[PDB]
Design an enzyme around this catalytic site. Sequence first.
Site, PDB file in Angstrom:
ATOM      1  CG  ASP A  86       4.698  18.560  -6.322  1.00  0.00           C
ATOM      2  OD1 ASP A  86       4.093  18.265  -7.382  1.00  0.00           O
ATOM      3  OD2 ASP A  86       4.298  19.467  -5.570  1.00  0.00           O
ATOM      4  CG  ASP A 180      -1.575  -3.637   8.452  1.00  0.00           C
ATOM      5  OD1 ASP A 180      -1.793  -3.399   9.689  1.00  0.00           O
ATOM      6  OD2 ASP A 180      -0.707  -3.069   7.734  1.00  0.00           O
TER       7      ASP A 180
END
Lengths: 257, 257, 258, 258, 258, 258
Positions: A86, A180
């Site tokens: 949005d 990670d």
Amino acid sequence: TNSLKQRLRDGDEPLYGLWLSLGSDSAAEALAHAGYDWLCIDMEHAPNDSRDVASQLRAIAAAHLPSEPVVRVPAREPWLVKRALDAGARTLMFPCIETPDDAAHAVRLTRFPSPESPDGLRGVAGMVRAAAFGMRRDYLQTANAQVAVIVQVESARGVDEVERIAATPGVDCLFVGPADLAASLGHLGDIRHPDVETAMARVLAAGKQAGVAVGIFAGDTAAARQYREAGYRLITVSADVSWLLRATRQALQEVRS
Amino acid sequence: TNSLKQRLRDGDEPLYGLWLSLGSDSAAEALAHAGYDWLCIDMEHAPNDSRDVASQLRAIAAAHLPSEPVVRVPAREPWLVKRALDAGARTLMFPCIETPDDAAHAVRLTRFPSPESPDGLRGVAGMVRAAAFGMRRDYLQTANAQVAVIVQVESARGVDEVERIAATPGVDCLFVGPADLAASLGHLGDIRHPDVETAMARVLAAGKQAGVAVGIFAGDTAAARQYREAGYRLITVSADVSWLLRATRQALQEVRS
Amino acid sequence: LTNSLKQRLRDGDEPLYGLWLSLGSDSAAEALAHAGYDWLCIDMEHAPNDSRDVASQLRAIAAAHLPSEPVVRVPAREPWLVKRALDAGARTLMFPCIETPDDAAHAVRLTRFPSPESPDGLRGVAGMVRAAAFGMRRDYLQTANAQVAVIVQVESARGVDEVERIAATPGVDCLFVGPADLAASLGHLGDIRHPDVETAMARVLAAGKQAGVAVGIFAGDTAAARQYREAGYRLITVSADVSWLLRATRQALQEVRS
Amino acid sequence: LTNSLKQRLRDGDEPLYGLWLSLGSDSAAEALAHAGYDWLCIDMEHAPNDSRDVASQLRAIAAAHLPSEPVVRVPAREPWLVKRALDAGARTLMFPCIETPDDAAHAVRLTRFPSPESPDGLRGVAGMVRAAAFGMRRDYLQTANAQVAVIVQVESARGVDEVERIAATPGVDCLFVGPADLAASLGHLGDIRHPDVETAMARVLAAGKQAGVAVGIFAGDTAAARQYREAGYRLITVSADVSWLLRATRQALQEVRS
Amino acid sequence: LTNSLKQRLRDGDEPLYGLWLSLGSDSAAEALAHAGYDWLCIDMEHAPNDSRDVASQLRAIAAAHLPSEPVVRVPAREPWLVKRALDAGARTLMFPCIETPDDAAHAVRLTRFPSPESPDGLRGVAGMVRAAAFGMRRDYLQTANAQVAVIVQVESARGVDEVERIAATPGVDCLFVGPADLAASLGHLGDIRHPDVETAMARVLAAGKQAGVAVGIFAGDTAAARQYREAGYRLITVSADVSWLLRATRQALQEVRS
Amino acid sequence: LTNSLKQRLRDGDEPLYGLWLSLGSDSAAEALAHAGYDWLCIDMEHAPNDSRDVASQLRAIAAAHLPSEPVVRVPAREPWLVKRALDAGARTLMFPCIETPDDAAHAVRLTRFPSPESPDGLRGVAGMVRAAAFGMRRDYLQTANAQVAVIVQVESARGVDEVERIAATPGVDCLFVGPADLAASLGHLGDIRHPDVETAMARVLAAGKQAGVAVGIFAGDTAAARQYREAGYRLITVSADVSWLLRATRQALQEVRS
């Protein structure tokens, strides 16, 4: 016309990025003048919430230059993805994609239901930033084609399933975060451990065999050039805060010497 | 006293609202002077987080006029509903309500556990805004009676299950967003499509039969009038930004003609 | 590279239509950047827009990639406030309360780097600000003066008496009438159609026409804006965001209820 | 507790190296507090830092618990703006556009509680502010004046002409040259290496040496900072946060592409 | 700069007094950092504190340079929220509604990097975050885990029933009782003195003593706080910022009016 | 529609108790709007409250729907700052540093639209501001003056010397004594009980009584506030938010540890 998506899918040249961790509108607008192909507004490991993301996308756009924004969402939660879209983000990165179903779901969240995409879960709201506040009622007919999906493979399970992940329709890029991955594989802090290098190589070969772009975060320019030579295309050349600190510490050393 | 709750239950008269998408305290305050029965602070398709909701609620309240605030939460997550309620929102709208279990759960999240609501899940903290920072002594005993729950029916499944959802204790209003429903039903951007209109007609009939008010989002006054004539009660007369754009563009073409 | 509002003000005869931005909202500014206006005014005098708000609204308007030119009305003619607005990248500034040609000349000086064309310039130099693309516009210093436009608001009785000499001040690109403040200073608070107020306004417009300097005006409604267009005003404000928002929402409610 | 910047400015002969903070970023301020600089400047003149930004940047730098001393350049010598900076806990203030010994003395007075050593002090008492630890620092009225440092910027022709008398003003702890503005003011906009500018800068530096007052300067690059250090400047700014960020990232892109 | 709250929690009998911070104010937080409390809790669950607020309040407390240990109550055990709070620099986290030993073990895992000491760790790595001094703390990955502390809130029947096993979970540094939530959950909303509730509370306390795990509790007033101290609770909240603010200003008005 | 503080100042004999808001916090403001005070002061001089913070705190106080009247102390007597505070909806203003009857009259003028009632008013007109209910109050300009109150702060030897003339100035609704600034200014920094200071205070108090003008004062504690009420002060500040927060929390800790 999402140019980053066009080049990922239809080019062979590398695409160089900067990570934006500082959450600064002025730093984003300044860096929109740095000549990079893309810029990443991180919501996962930087404290950028919805208004910060919209402010930084505005600041980038205000430069009127070619750098494409990418937003890393904090998680594959429908409301979070909805906020980023949005706000006008057209390329999203999803962390912790471990299975083909994780990836399919990520893609559904970005798709308005269509014959094009039958099972889409993207919500409609015609007055948001992405629909130019209602001034493009045509929005709904084009948007699906211009939304890019980057999936982060950062676990043993994800590497084992990476061929199925790469074959998921709507996955436009596989992204490797070495730090990670290294931690997840039992090698915290050592990204050049052979187990880790084997896992990264497997992600890279899987992308190549699926015709899917592969990206990676580089801590420095030497590593970035190695990754380019190896065939990675979406290459992050480290982060805003990291460059700021290296450069200001180097300058100080020079004056004091 | 939550007067929107009381008129939704006892009244037949329509209750007209406006959607607040801009995230602006000043716009919220100004529009609190416009004569509407209710105003919606949207957290789902507008970037309003907890502090934004508190600031708009204060801004509306500052006007000292009759407009009842409604808050649409981003999702049915406990922590989000907790933030809305603690900030003092007393009428909540839930997106994506598809089953009577979903509806029951939304209601449970809004209730302190009491003999009237033994399975209430609302968390207790006495110092929050909703309790006047500790000054409303009897907050725990008076709260549940003033909370209204509006469930948005926006999918094929929700429409299928709408009679069971309407029968759910605690559901004060069924809300139709025609744009979302049209997407969900395979008619993206076409709210006039006859399968969309049948779906909307079914939700309205469900409400009349259950004695539960029905609400709807209208994009323009012609549609709002159609809905009123059809029996919808809680009618949104479009959105702040849509009126702002229509009126300023119309004024320009009048001046320059 | 070019301030098109300045160029049109100095060179064209056509009207330039603006909207006042009072709501202080980035989303509202970005939305209104799609409304087709020639200019949009971020007000610092009668709205709570401070330096960060100005920068965020500029970015928001620029993000639409459409033709509206931002104008900033500063709170007062203080060097530090003018510096803030120019550094943030506003290239057209409106100064309130300009009553003498000395005031107008000072306002101009505050916007100019010292140079051959403006040897008395008082603008402070800093190469790393938003207006200089953060250091990337390497010739910002040599090219900035030519693109800065100055609008002086004439809104007092002394200002009206001095208006021909204000108009002849080099660097004044537009004379702006605020009828509400003008009516108040002439002793006619709330009464912009009092004949003495209409006489004052007519004088300011005529001064502009005779000098070849654009005249602007704040119109409270469309009939007024059209009267002003017909009379020869060029920089015409078609009221304000918050006013249109209230009028249109209130009108819609009435229509739905009737 | 002790303002170590003021201490070393008065007592020492060593250079004190700083960085300009123009980004207005809390995180950038805390990160840079780890970079080893002697001082960091939160600019309110040519960057959009208002009172709450100054407080939040001061808090951010303090949270690192490391030696960098914050400097706040005020927008202007207005009592209410100086008050805001001091109340927020800024103990070293930089004042732009100081041109006369009287300007300098006024800046000093604004920073001093009225007291035996500073009978004409104009600093306002308000025991509940951050600078007074919200009332918890009970000896604040006895200890504050000695820990406040005043840096005056000389960056106009008039200031240079009066620089010896400015330097002799009690309470002036540093004279700071901004070469860019000074060059503009001498009619050499954009050229800080013109001989007329060089002569003016050398006069400021000699005036400080002669008064026993430290001299500072803004440097655009490390070669210039080193030339300044060799010439005898002590309070030397090694350019700005945004400047280094842009140079570093652009140089990195070329390396990776080459 | 070691986590002294974790250290003192792991050992001994001494009470550790705290204040709840609900106001969401940087200024309040820094002021209260001077008040002599052992710990201060930035609540995200029942106060509107999001990531940037947590970072800003952590900075504000740090700026006081005093011994109070910040604690952050996360809104829920969602990995992204826990990640936000750790990356912001929070070293002591409180988790609401922990009901099983698996819940407790999961909360602990979310706070630990995967390492030999904690091979099941799930904390994700980002070297540039505030907790890592933005990359300047070179040994951060190897030293972080040892300074992270975990408080689990027991506030349900189910949690009470499992409390001995929750207490035995490695990495649980403190069992925290919220009587208001517990009472509500046991069907005694608003009545924390009902014997069913006191029984439940007594059981949590006995579990922690028997296990050598500190037990904490929220007290709404000093009478309560004292009663809990005498009963053996160690981590005692002495009510909340806003409650003391209201109490004190209301009693001061009564004293001046009487 | 009634500024009840203005009416009671002019027509009452009762004391009017207040609280100083220095924390800049919306939640603290709204909470304190429940504490029963006659008035609450949002400080812009010695707390970091800019225009948006003032509007946010006014909203927050109004949201409580209770009787406390907000007062705003502006930073300085500058037209643009006064416009910002009035436009935001503050109806009672406190001006710092009022030294002459000309100062006081100017301040009054700055708050008044030019009407028949106040033909010399200098308040700049804007009809769409928050104070005007964003334009819904169509007679705002014509009716605003009657509800605007002016409080002038006497804090220098010059002000005390001129206090009879200041008090006689039409539109001055209250003379306010800040003992700490007054003490400092008279050469008695930190010594508010010195006979010179008590003599000056007595004179301000006598001047108000003679003139029929309310006199106000800042009290640091309840015993001082009680003495001031006994001496005949009316507008009595019962210290500050942050001072009560610290006293109350520190007292609570003492009582629990004892």
